[PDB]
Amino acid sequence: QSQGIQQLLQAEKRAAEKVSEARKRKNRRLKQAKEEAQAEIEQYRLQREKEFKAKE
Amino acid sequence: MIFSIWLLAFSPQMCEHLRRYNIIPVLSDILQESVKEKVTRIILAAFRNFLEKSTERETRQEYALAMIQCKVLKQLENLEQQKYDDEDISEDIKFLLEKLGESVQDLSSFDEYSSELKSGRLEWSPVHKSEKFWRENAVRLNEKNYELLKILTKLLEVSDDPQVLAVAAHDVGEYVRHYPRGKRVIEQLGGKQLVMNHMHHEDQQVRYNALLAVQKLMVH
């Protein structure tokens, strides 16, 4: 009998693991947004810098 | 004998110390079992001396509350309605009805559950059974450095009574249902192991409440 309840602890542990992995993916993926935004901001900044240098 | 106890209760320093003999229950038993005029009067005298000579507020509250855990105030109302010709009965009834009229408000809290835990009187009582208690208070199982959790854990560890075990499993089920962090606290205390063992208890009422607690613990 009791072994099935230990298998529920194992299922709970797998659930906590699945939740933790998804949360860690979200934490990294949210930081990747900042890193890619900064690259695209600099790409534009350098473009307006070039256009202004050309105008001058 | 209750005259001997009434005489013992004349000193504040004696009233502070006499608590360890567990004397209020035996007087409260006789107060229900023996309506005899003398016996009634000397219990009222002993109870008045214990409470009134307690210059320590904690001791005063404790004598008033121990009488209320014995539900003496209801019996004092029965004795107020009963015919007695003596002012030394009548006026000491009304005195104790006023002072126990404080501690009845303390007990008739959700703390009727607190006292059932403290005394070990776990049962299918209205305060165990009613959702309102847990729905408003479940977190309080952590109070006094987890005292109520420690009691329920000890009872689930060493009680012989399937009612106490099943009641405690139900109490754990509603604790987790109404306080989500309570799941983490039972998991940190390891109290789950008792419930998971009692899944194979000899009583179907315990096994049912253990399974129901495992459901409320592991299933959303």
3-state secondary structure of B122: coil
- Report the C-alpha gap between B44 and B95 in whole angstroms: 9
Distance from CA of A36 to the nearest CA of B (A): 37
Contact A2 B199 (CB under 8 A): yes
Resolved by: cryo-EM
Q: Does B67 touch chain A (CB under 8 A)?
A: no
Amino acid at B202: E
Interface of A to B at Cβ within 8 Å reads 1-2, 5-6, 8-9, 11-12
Which residues of chain B lie closer than 8 angstroms to A1, CB-CB?
Answer: 199-200
Contact B155, B164 (CB under 8 A): yes
Token pair of B199, please?
Answer: 């899944």
Q: Does B220 touch chain A (CB under 8 A)?
A: no
Distance from CA of B199 to the nearest CA of A (A): 7
Closest Cα to residue B22, out of B76, B63, B57? Answer: B63
B 186-215 residues with CB below 8 A of A?
A: 196-197, 199-200, 214
- Report the C-alpha gap between B118 and B112 in whole angstroms: 10
Cβ neighbours, 10 Å, residue B208? 15
3-state secondary structure of A43: helix
Which residues of chain A lie closer than 8 angstroms to B199, CB-CB?
Answer: 1-2, 5
List Cα–Cα distances, B167 to B102, B136, B206, in angstroms: 30, 19, 8
- Report the C-alpha gap between B161 and B123 in whole angstroms: 10
Contact A2 B214 (CB under 8 A): no
Test mutation, B193, B194, B195, B196, chain A, max A CBs within 10 A: B196
CB contact burial B21-38 (16+ within 10 A = b; e otherwise): eebbeebbebbeeeeeee
Token pair of B202, please?
Answer: 């000899």
- Quickly list DSSP for B11-60: SHHHHHHGGGG-HHHHHHHHHHH---HHHHHHHHHHHHHHHHT--SHHHH
Contact B186, B176 (CB under 8 A): yes
One-letter-per-residue 3-state SS of B124-192? CCHHHHCHHHHHHHHHHHHHHHHHHHHHHHHHHHHCCCHHHHHHHHHHHHHHHHHCCHHHHHHHHHCCH
Largest CA distance in chain A: 84
List Cα–Cα distances, B12 to A13, B7, B16, B24, B143, in angstroms: 58, 12, 6, 16, 31
Matching residue, tokens 């560890």: B157
Contact A2 B197 (CB under 8 A): yes
Q: Which residues contact B179 (CB under 8 A, 6 or more apart)?
A: B138, B139, B141
